[PDB]
C-alpha cells in the first residue's frame, strides 16, 4: 500500500566518521576503514549529528521498506567492524582421521591448506581473503580463528573452509567430519 515514509537510525560512536556521497559509504575508525556501495538500493541518508545518521524511504513498497533495515544493518556492521572488529572461530571435527590444517603461500598467497580429511590423500586449499587474518589457537585443540574488519569477509572466508570439507558418499550424520564455525564474535574483549 506504499508507505509514505519509513526511516531508520544508524548510531555513530566516539571513534568513527562515516561519510557518504551518491551511495558510496566510507566508515573509518580505530581498526582501519571499510567502504561499501549502496547505489543498488534507493534509500536517502541524512546526517543529524556526528553520532546520528538517518536512512529513509519515501512512498515505498513492502520489498523496498524491507530493504531499508538491511541497509541500516549493513552499515552498522561496518561501524562495529571498524571499532570492535570480528572474530569467527571454527573447530575441527573428526572421528578418526586427524584433520591437519596449515597455512601456505605460492606467489604471495596465504592459503588455508587442509590435509588428511577423512584421510584424503587429496590436499584441500582455501585462499585467505584480504582483510581477514588467521591464528591457529594456542591452548585450544583443533581451533582455527579468522578475524578482520569486514563481517562479510571473515564469515565468507570461514564458510569457504567449512565447506571445502563437505562429505560425499557417506551418511553425513555418522560421518560428522569437518571444520565448523563454532563461535561468532568481536575482536575487542570485555565486549
Amino acid at each position: 500500500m506504499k508507505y509514505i515514509q519509513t526511516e531508520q537510525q544508524i548510531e555513530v560512536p566516539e571513534g568513527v566518521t562515516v561519510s557518504i556521497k551518491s551511495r558510496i559509504v566510507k566508515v573509518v575508525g580505530p581498526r582501519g576503514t571499510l567502504t561499501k556501495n549502496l547505489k543498488h538500493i534507493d534509500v536517502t541518508f541524512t546526517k543529524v549529528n556526528n553520532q546520528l545518521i538517518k536512512v529513509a524511504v519515501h512512498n515505498g513498497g513492502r520489498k523496498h521498506v524491507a530493504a531499508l533495515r538491511t541497509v541500516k544493518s549493513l552499515v552498522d556492521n561496518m561501524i562495529t567492524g571498524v571499532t570492535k572488529g570480528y572474530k569467527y572461530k571454527m573447530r575441527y571435527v573428526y572421528a578418526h582421521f586427524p584433520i591437519n590444517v596449515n597455512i601456505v603461500e605460492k606467489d604471495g598467497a596465504k592459503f588455508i591448506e587442509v590435509r588428511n580429511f577423512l584421510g584424503d590423500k587429496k590436499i584441500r586449499n582455501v585462499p585467505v581473503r584480504d582483510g581477514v587474518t588467521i591464528e591457529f589457537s594456542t591452548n585450544v585443540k583443533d581451533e582455527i580463528v579468522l578475524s578482520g574488519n569486514s563481517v562479510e569477509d571473515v564469515s565468507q572466508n570461514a564458510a569457504d573452509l567449512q565447506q571445502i570439507c563437505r562429505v560425499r558418499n557417506k551418511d553425513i550424520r555418522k560421518f560428522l567430519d569437518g571444520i565448523y564455525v563454532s563461535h561468532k564474535g568481536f575482536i575487542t574483549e570485555d565486549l
Binding site: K2, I4, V12, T17, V18, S19, I20, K21, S22, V28, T44, F45, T46, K47, N50, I53, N59
Partner: protein
C-alpha cells in the same frame, strides 16, 4: 573528520508550498497547496492569480522552492491574506525560473522589425566583446 552525509534535499508537498500549474485553464499561474489528499492528489488555491480552489493531481503542477505560513485546509480568503502577507508573488517574480519564463515570452512576442534590430545589437555587442576577449 566530521561526518559529511550528502543531503539530497527535495521540494516537498506540504500546506503552503507554492506550485506552478502546468496545464489547463490556469497553467502558468502559481497557487498554494492547501490540504493534501493522497499520494497523487492535492487541494490547491491561487486567489491572487485567479485559479479556482480545486483538487488537482500533482502531476499537473510543478513544485517550486517557495513556501509560506498556511493553516492546513485554509479557505480561499485566508489563503489570499497569508499570501500577500508573505509577499510570495514578488518573491517568485525575482527568481530565475520566473525571469526565464518572462524572457521567452518577450522573445516570442517580437515584431519582425524588433527581431531585425535585435541582430544589429548583437553585432554591436559581439564587436566590443570579441575585442575584450583578446586584451587579457
Amino acid at each position: 573528520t566530521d561526518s559529511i552525509v550528502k543531503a539530497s534535499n527535495w521540494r516537498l508537498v506540504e500546506v503552503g508550498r507554492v506550485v506552478l500549474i502546468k496545464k489547463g485553464q490556469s497553467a502558468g499561474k502559481l497557487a498554494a497547496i492547501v490540504e493534501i489528499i493522497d499520494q497523487k492528489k492535492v487541494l490547491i488555491d491561487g486567489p491572487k492569480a485567479g485559479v479556482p480552489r480545486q483538487a488537482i493531481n500533482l502531476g499537473q503542477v510543478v513544485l517550486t522552492p517557495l513556501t509560506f505560513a498556511l493553516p492546513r485546509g485554509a479557505r480561499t480568503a485566508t489563503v489570499s491574506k497569508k499570501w500577500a502577507a508573505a509577499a510570495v508573488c514578488e518573491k517568485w517574480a525575482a527568481s530565475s525560473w520566473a525571469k526565464k519564463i518572462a524572457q521567452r515570452e518577450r522573445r516570442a512576442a517580437l515584431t519582425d522589425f524588433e527581431r531585425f534590430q535585435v541582430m544589429v545589437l548583437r553585432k554591436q555587442k559581439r564587436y566590443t566583446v570579441k575585442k575584450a576577449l583578446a586584451k587579457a
